[PDB]
Amino acid sequence: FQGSMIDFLKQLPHLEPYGNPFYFIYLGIALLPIFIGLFFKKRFAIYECLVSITFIVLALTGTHASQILALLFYIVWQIIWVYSYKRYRSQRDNKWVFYLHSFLVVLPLILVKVEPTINGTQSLLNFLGISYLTFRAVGMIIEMRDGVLKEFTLGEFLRFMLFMPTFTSGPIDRFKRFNEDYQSIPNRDELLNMLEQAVKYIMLGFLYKFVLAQIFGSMLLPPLKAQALSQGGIFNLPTLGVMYVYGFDLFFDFAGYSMFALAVSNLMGIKSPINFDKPFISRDMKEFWNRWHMSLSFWFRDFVFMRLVIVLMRNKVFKNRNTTSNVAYIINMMVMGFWHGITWYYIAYGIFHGIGLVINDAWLRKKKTINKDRKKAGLKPLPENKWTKALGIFITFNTVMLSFLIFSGFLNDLWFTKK
Amino acid sequence: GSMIDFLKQLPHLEPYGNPFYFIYLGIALLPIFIGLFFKKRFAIYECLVSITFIVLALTGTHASQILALLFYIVWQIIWVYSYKRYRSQRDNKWVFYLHSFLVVLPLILVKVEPTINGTQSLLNFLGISYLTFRAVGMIIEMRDGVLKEFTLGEFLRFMLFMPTFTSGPIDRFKRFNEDYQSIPNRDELLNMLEQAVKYIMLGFLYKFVLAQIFGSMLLPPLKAQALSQGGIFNLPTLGVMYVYGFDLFFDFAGYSMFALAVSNLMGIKSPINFDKPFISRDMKEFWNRWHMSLSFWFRDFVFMRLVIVLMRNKVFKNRNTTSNVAYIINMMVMGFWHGITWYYIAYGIFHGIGLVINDAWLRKKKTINKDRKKAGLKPLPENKWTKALGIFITFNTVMLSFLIFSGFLNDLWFTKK
Amino acid sequence: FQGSMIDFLKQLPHLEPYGNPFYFIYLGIALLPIFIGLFFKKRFAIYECLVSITFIVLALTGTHASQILALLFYIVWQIIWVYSYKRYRSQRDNKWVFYLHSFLVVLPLILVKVEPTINGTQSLLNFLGISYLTFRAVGMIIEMRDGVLKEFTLGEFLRFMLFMPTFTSGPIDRFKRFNEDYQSIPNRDELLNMLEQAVKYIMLGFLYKFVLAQIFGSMLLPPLKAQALSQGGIFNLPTLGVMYVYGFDLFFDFAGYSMFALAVSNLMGIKSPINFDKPFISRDMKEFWNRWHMSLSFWFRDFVFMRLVIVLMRNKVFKNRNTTSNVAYIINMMVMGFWHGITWYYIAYGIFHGIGLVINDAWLRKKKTINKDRKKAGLKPLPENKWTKALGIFITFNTVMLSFLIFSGFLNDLWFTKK
Amino acid sequence: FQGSMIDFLKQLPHLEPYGNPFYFIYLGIALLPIFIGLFFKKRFAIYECLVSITFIVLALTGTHASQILALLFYIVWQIIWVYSYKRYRSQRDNKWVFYLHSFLVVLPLILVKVEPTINGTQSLLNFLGISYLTFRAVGMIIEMRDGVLKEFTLGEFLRFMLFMPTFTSGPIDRFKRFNEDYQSIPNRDELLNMLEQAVKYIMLGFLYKFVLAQIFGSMLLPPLKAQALSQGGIFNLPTLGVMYVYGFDLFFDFAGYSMFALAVSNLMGIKSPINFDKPFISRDMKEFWNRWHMSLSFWFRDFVFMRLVIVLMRNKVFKNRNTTSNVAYIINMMVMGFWHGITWYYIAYGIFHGIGLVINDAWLRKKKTINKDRKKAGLKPLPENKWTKALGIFITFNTVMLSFLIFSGFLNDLWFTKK
Amino acid sequence: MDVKAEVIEIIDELFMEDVSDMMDEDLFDAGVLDSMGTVELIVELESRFDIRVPVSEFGRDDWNTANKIVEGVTELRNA
Amino acid sequence: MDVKAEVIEIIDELFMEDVSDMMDEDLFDAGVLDSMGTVELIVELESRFDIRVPVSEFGRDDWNTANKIVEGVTELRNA
Amino acid sequence: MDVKAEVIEIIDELFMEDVSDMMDEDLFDAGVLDSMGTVELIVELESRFDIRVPVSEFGRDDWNTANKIVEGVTELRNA
Amino acid sequence: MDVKAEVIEIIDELFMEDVSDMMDEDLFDAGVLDSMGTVELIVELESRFDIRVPVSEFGRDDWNTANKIVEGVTELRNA
Ligand SMILES: CCCCCCCCCCCCO[C@@H]1O[C@H](CO)[C@@H](O[C@H]2O[C@H](CO)[C@@H](O)[C@H](O)[C@H]2O)[C@H](O)[C@H]1O
C-alpha cells in the first residue's frame, strides 16, 4: 500500500568499491579461501558466488540504493534475451533475428544513455555499472552468432557477466577467453606469479588512486576550473591548465581502478585484460588507441570496427578501400562517443578522435608510399631519430589532451551557458 | 548494582537476526572447523563458544530466564542420571513413566502456566520447547536399552548444542554422539563446507528478504483490512492466510538453514528441517516434508510407541481404528506442544483429521485399484490432472491450517480467549 | 643537576601485565618469531631478551613508574652478591658465609616488607614483583651451597631471574629445572602439545580473570564488605558472605594470572611450574597445601621446611620426631606469613595454618594407630564411605575459607583493633 | 583552494627519523615482508621503492616542508651530471672533464655550506641529508674516473643514492660495494645472523640514544652551559664539565643513530659500513680515526687523502715523504671541517685534528728512530707497560674531548668572537 | 523353535495369504507390508519371541528382506 | 578440390602482385599484406564458397600466414 | 667400609622392628616408614658416612628406593 | 731493457736498502715497509710503466703478497 521497500534498501551497509584502504583487508580476508582452494586445483563455485554477491551489493547500496532493484531487473532481462537466442541458434541462423536479439539485449543501455537527454532525469534502469555489463551480454550474443559459442550453463553466464572485480567500470572481457581461463586452473608457479603481480598492483593502485589521483583532482582541478570560468573568452591559460591536469587525473584514477580490478581478479585466479600500458608515450594516434583503455578499444575493434568494415566490403559500396577505412573509423568512434553518453561534448570527442585517426592513417599511407618511391629510386628514406620521435610524442600528446578537454565537459561550462 | 539488571546490561544478540551475527559466528567457528579438518577436536573451545553464544542470545530484555535455564539443566541431570543408575538394576515399566514425566515437567509447566491464571512460569526460557525433546529422547533410549553409558561431557554437549539451541532441528542422542565422535574425511568435509555456504546464502534469501517481504510489507496492512472488514470470512482473510503461511515457511526455513550451516561448520550434520513442503501430493507426504525433524520425532517416539502399546493390550479389534486413534492423539499432542490455546489445539486436531481422512482415501483407492485389476479394468491414471488436483487441494488445506495456527481467527472471530 | 629523571620515565606507556585482552595480541605477535624458532631447534637468545625487556618495562612503568629505577638497582644488587658467593664456592665452603650471603641477597625483600611497619610508607627499593624475584636469587645461592650448581653465565642468570611471564607474581621456579627446560628444545609434537595447552590456558584465563574474577570482586565484594562493616559485632552473616566471596575471588584471580603466565611461558618454550590444581576439593589440609599455590608451597617445602627439619634433627634438640615436625611446620608457616607482609593479620594467617597442619598431623597419627590396633584386634577398619569424604571436604573448605578471611585483612576493618 | 602547495606539504605527517620508538614499530611492520622474502632468492622492487619513498617523505616534511621540493631538483641535478660523465667516460677521460663533473656534482652541497656564511640565512637547495648524499654521487663520479665502474641502470643509481635507512645522516657508502651486496642475496644462516645483529643493534641504540643521550644532553648539558655562560672568563670548571658532557652526548647520539641505521639496513638485507667501534680507547690519535665515524673517516682517507698524496707525489712538487704526508693530513682534515660547515669553530676543529694527526705521526717516527738508535747502541727500547698505554689513552681521550668542545660551538658563545 | 519355521507359521496363521511360495518377491507391492502394517507383524513376533525390540532404532531399510529379520533376531538373542 | 590455386589466382586479381612463387615467405616483411589487408581476402571466401570465417577472436597471431588461411577453411566447414 | 652392613644394621634399629628380610618392598605402601620420615635416615648416614645428601632438588622421587640409597654413597664417592 | 730484471730493480731503486732477498718474506715483520712506506713503491712504477692502478678501492687485501702484484700488473698491462 506504500511500496517503501526502497527505503529499506537504503538501510543496508555501504562500501565504496576500491574506495578505502580498509576495503582491501575485507577483500583479502574473504578471498583467502578461494585462493587457498585454487592452490590445490579446487574451485568451490559457491563461495565465489557468495563473496561476489556480498561485495556487489555492498558496492551498489549507496545513496542511490534503489539501483539494486534495477540490477535485479537487468539480469532478469539479459537472461530472457540470451537463451531466447541460443534456442534459436540451434534451429536457424538468420541475420535479422540476430539483429533484433542484439538490439533487445543492448536496449537497457540505450534507455540509460538516451532518457536524460530527452526526459532530463536519470532513467530507472540505470545502476552503477550498466555501461560495462551490456558489453559482455552483447559479446555472448555475437559469439553465438559466429558459431564460436555453443551450449553452456547458467552458472558460467551469471558468474561471467556479474564478475565481481570488474563490475563497476572495469576491464571488458569476452566469454570464450574468460571461460577458458576459469576452467584451466593455473599451476603453483603461475599462482605465485599471479599473487606477486597482484600485490604489486594493489600497492601501485594505492599510489595511483589514493595519492596521485586525489592530488590532481581535489587540489588543482577546482581552482583551475574556477579561474578559467572567471577569465572567460574562447581560450586562455587557466583552461589549458585545467585540460592538462584533468587529463592526468582521469588517467591516474582510471589506471588505479584498473590495477585494483586486475589485482582482485588475479586473486580469484582470472587474468582480466589490461587497461593501460604507458598511454602518454604513444607517439602516434593509432599507437595511442592500442595503449589507452585497452579493453574498450580492443572490444570496439573486434566487434564494432571489424564487423562494420567487413559488411561494408561485402557490398563493395565504395570504390576505394581508403574511403571504407575512413568511414569505418568515423562510425566506430561516433559509436564510442554515444556509448560515453549522448551530449554535445561526448559526440564531439568521438568525431574528433575519428577525424584524428583518419588523418593519421592518411599521413601514414602517404609516408609509406613516399618511402616506397624513394626505395624504387634508390634514395635513402626520411630519417627516424630522437628529434622525430620527440615531435611525434609531443604532437600526439597535445592532440590527446585537447580531446580530453572536449570529453571533460568543462568546455561546455567555460564556452557555453552564460557564466 | 548486582541484580537482574546486571544480566540485562549484557550484550544481546538475536539468534540469526542480522548478517553481522553471521560474521561474528563465522569468525568464532573458523578455528574449530580448521582443527576438525585435521581430525582433532578442541572440546574446551567448543564449550566456551557455545556458552557465550547461548548467553548472548539469552541476555535480552528479560534475562532472568538465564537463571531459570540453569535450574532446568540441573533439574534434567538430577533425573537423567537418576534413571541411568536405575537402568542397570531393572526396568519396572513404571519408573520409566515417572522419569519421563519429571523430565517433561518444565515443559508442561511452561505450557500450562500462561493458560491457567495470567502469565508464563519463571522456569520458561528461549528454547525450552526444543530442549525437552533431547532429554526425553535420552530417557526413551535408556528405556529401550539402546544407550547404556555416557559421560557428563557428552550429555551436556548434546543437550545444550548451540546451533540448535534456540529452536533448531530436534536431534537424538545416539545419532548425535556417533556423529560427534567420528570426524568425517577431507572431501566429505569440503562438501559439508560448500553445503554450509549454500545454506547461508539460501537462508539470507529466505529469511532476510522473502520473510521480510511477506511479513513486514504485506502482512500488517492485510491484517488491518481484515480486522476492519469483520464478518465470518472475507477476501482479506484469504490474503492474510496465504501471506502468513508463506511468511512462516520462509522464516522457519531460513532459521533451519542457518542452523544447519552453523552445525556443518561445527562438523555435525543436524537433521534437515524442510524439503520443499508445498510440492506435497497428499496430506501424509506433507508431514515427511514440513518440519521434518519434529515430525519424524513425533512419528518415531510418540506415534509408533502408542500404536505398539495399543496393540499389546489388543484394545481395538481392527487395524484401522488403531491407526486413526494413534494419528489423532499424535497430532493433538503436537498441537499441545505448540501451546495450550484454542487455536493450537484446533490446528493439531485438524491436521489429525486430515491425516486420517487421507489414510481412508488411500485405503479406498487401493481397494478400488484391486477391484479394477481383478475385473481387468485399467487403474486410474495420474499424469497431469489428478496430481495437480491433489497438490492444489493439499496446499490449500495446509494454508487453511496455517491460518488457524496463526491465531488470526482470535481477532477475526470474538470467541472467548 | 636537578633530579627530574622521575618525570622522564613516567609518561611512557603503561601496558598492563595480562590486562586488557588486546595485550595478548601484541605479545602474541611479539612471540611469533621465538616460537617459530623453537620448531627448528634454534633459540634466538637476543630477540627474546628484547621482548622480555620491552614487556617488563611496559608492565612496570605505571603510576608508580619510579619503581623502574628500583629495579635497575635490585638487579645489580643480586649480580653484586650472587657472583660473590660463586667465587667463594670455588675456594671454600662454610655455613656462616653462606648464611651471610643469603641474608644480604634477601635483604631487599626484608626492607620492602618491614619499612611500612616502622616508617609507614613504601620503601624506595620496591617494585611490582620483588616478592617473587628474591626467590629465584636465594634459590640459586641455595643450589650453590649444596653443590648442585657450579657454573653459569650472566645470560642464563638474567634470563632466569627476570623471566618475562612469571615476573609480576607468577610461578616460582628453580634454576636447575628452568635451565634444563631451556637448553633442550622440545620436538615438534611436544611443541604442538604446548601450543594447544597454551591456547587452552589463554581462554581459561580469560574466563577466570575477566568474567568470574570481576563478578566476584567488583560486584559482590564491595556491598558485602559495606554491609558487614555497618552491621558490626564480632561476627555476622554479611562477614561470612564476604569471607566466601573473597575466597573465591582470590582463587579465581590468582588462577587466571597463573594460567596466563603458564600460557605465555609455553609459547616461549618453557614449562613453568603449575600453581593451582583443584584446591577446593581438597579433603585435608596436608592435601590442601599440595593444591593451593603449588609453586610457593613446594618452594617452602623444598628449601625452608625440609632444611629446617634436617638442621633440627642434626642436633637432636627434641627427643621425639613429632615435636620436631610440629615446630618445623609452625616455623615454615610463620615465615610464609611474614613473606606475605609483616602485619598482624598475615602473621595470624601463618600461625593459623601452621596450627591447622599440626592438628591434622596429630589426627592422622591417631587414625593410623587406631586403625592398626583395630586390625590387630581382628575388627573391621574405619569406614571410607562417601559421607566421610564429604565431611572431610566440607571441614577443610570451611577452615580454608576462615584462613582466607583472616588473610583478607577485612578483620582489620571490621575490628578496629590496630594492635 | 589549496592556497600554496607548501601548506599542503606541511600538513602531511612528519616522522622524525629514529625518534620515538613507535617509529621503529612502524618501520618493523613495514619492512617485515622484505626481510621475509630475503630468505629466498627474490626481492620486491616496487615494495622497496614505495617504502623508501614514503619514509623519506615522512622524514622530510614538517616545519621545513619546502626542502622536499629542493630534494627533487637535486636528484635531477645529479642525473644531469652523472649520466653526462658516463657518456663522456664511454669514449675518453680527460682530467679537466672529470674535475668539472665532480665540481658540478658537489655544487649543491657547496652552495648549501657557503650561502649561510655569506650574508644570508639558509639556501633553498638544502634538505635533511644533503651532507650525506653528495658523497655517494661524487663517489660515482670518482669511480667512473678510475674506470672501476662501467655500466649501471637508473634503478641501481637511484636506489643506491636514495637509500632510505641511510638518507638523513647515515653511514656514507661507496657504490661498487653496495651494488655487489645488492645483487647477491646472502644465505639463510647468514640472514639469521644479520637478524640477530639487527635486534642487538636496536637494543643498543635504545640504550645509546634514548637513555644515555638523554641523560647526557637533556638533563646535564643545559645547567652546565648556563653555569659556564654566567661564570664567563677564558676557561673555568663549568667549561670542562660542559666539554665532557657534550662530547659524551654527541658520541652517544651519533652511535644511536648509526646503530639504528645499521639495524634497518640489515633488515633490508644490506650490510652498511659500521660507524663506531669503541672510540675513546685509541692509544694514538691516528687510531681514533679508525674508530670514530669510521664510514666518513675511511671515505676521506680513500677518496680525498690518498688521491691527494698520489697527485702531490707524482708531480714531485715536494722533496720528502714527511712533508707530503703532513700537507695531505692538514688538507684532508681541513676539508672534513669544511664539510661540517663554514664557521670559525668547525674549521678550528678540523685543523686541530690535522695538527694532532701530524704531530702524532712525527712522534711515532721519532719513537721508531730512537728505538732503532738504542737497539744499535745496545740500549733497551722504551717499555710498553700498562702505565704507558694508560697515559697514552688518557692524553688521546682528553685531546678528543677538547676537540669536541671546539666542535660544539660553545666557544663561540663563551668567547663571543666572530659574531 | 526354529526361527524360520516360526516366521513361516506366523505369516499364514492369521491372514492365510498363501505367501509361502512368494517369499523372494517384493512384498511391498504385494499389499502385505506397507508403511503401517509392518508394525502389526512386529508386535505379532513380539508375542512369540517375547523380546522388546527397540523401535527408535528401527530404520526404514532395517527389515526390507525377511532374511534381515531372521538374522537380526538371532543376533539379538545371543546378546 | 584444391583451394591453394584459387587463392593464388585471386590474390593478384586485386593486389596486382605476383604471388605464384612467393608463398612461404613472410608477408609481413615483404609488405604484401598490411595487417588490415587480409580483410579484403576474407570477403573473397564469401564471394564463391558462401562461408564466413569468424572474426570475433581474429587477431594477428592465428591466421597471420597464408598457410593458416588455406588450412583453416577446410576445418571451418565441418566444426 | 660397607654401606650395606650399616644399612642392614640401622634398619632393624631405627624402627625397633626386625624387617631386614624385606629390602625391595615399596615403603610407600608398606607403611613401615612415612614420606616425611626419610630424613631420619638422611641424618643417620651423616653420622656414619660423613656425607650429606642434597635436598635442594631431591624430592619424593630421586632416592626413594632403598637400593638406590645404598648405592648413593658409592655413586657420590666418584665425584 | 729486461722487464723481469726491471721488476727486481724497482724495489731497490727507491730505498737503496737491498731488499731483494726479502722478496716473499713478511714485509710487516721485517719493518722495512708499512702502510705508508709501501705507497712510495706503489706510485714509483706508475711514472715508468704507465699504469693507473685504482687506489680508490685499495684495501688491505690486494698487495699483501709480493708475488700477486707482479702477475696482476702484467695481466693488466695489456688489459
Ligand atoms: C584450625 C584447626 C583445624 C584445622 C583443620 C583440621 C583439618 C583436619 C582435621 C579433620 C580431619 C578429618 O578429615 C579426614 O581426615 C582423614 C584422615 O584422618 C582424611 O583421610 C585421608 O588422609 C590422607 C589424605 O591426605 C591420606 O592418608 C588418605 O587419602 C586418607 O586417609 C579424610 O579424607 C578426611 O575426611
Residue numbers in the entry:
A (entry chain B), C (entry chain D), D (entry chain C): -3 to 415
B (entry chain A): -1 to 415
E (entry chain F), F (entry chain G), G (entry chain I), H (entry chain H): 1 to 79
Extract from the study:
DltB, a model member of the Membrane-Bound O-AcylTransferase (MBOAT) superfamily, plays a crucial role in D-alanylation of the lipoteichoic acid (LTA), a significant component of the cell wall of gram-positive bacteria. Through biochemical analysis and cryo-EM imaging, we discover that Streptococcus thermophilus DltB forms a homo-tetramer on the cell membrane. We further determined the cryo-EM structure of the tetramer form of apo DltB at 3.42 Å resolution, and DltB complexed with DltC at 3.50 Å resolution, and in complex with an inhibitor m-AMSA at 3.23 Å resolution. The tetrameric organization of DltB provides a scaffold for catalyzing D-alanyl transfer and regulating the channel opening and closing.
To understand how the D-alanyl group is delivered to the DltB tetramer, we determined the tetrameric structure of DltB/DltC complex. Each protomer binds a DltC without changing the tetrameric organization. DltC binds to the intracellular side of DltB via hydrophobic interactions (Met36 and Val39 from DltC interact with Met302, Val305, Ile306, and Met309 on the horizontal helix HC on DltB) and salt bridges (Glu40 from DltC interacts with Lys312 on the tip of HC and Arg317 on TMH8 from DltB). It sits on the HC helix at the entrance of the C-tunnel. Ser35 on DltC is approximately 20.4 Å away in straight distance from His336 residue at the active site on DltB. With the Ppant group attached to Ser35, it can insert into the tunnel with an extended conformation that reaches out to about 20 Å. Thus, considering the distance, DltC can bring the D-alanyl group to the active site of DltB directly. However, the tunnel is blocked by Trp285, Met332, and Ser293 in the current structures. Sterically, it is not possible for DltC to deliver the D-alanyl group to the active site of DltB in the resting state. This means a conformational change in DltB is required for DltC to deliver the D-alanyl group to the active site.
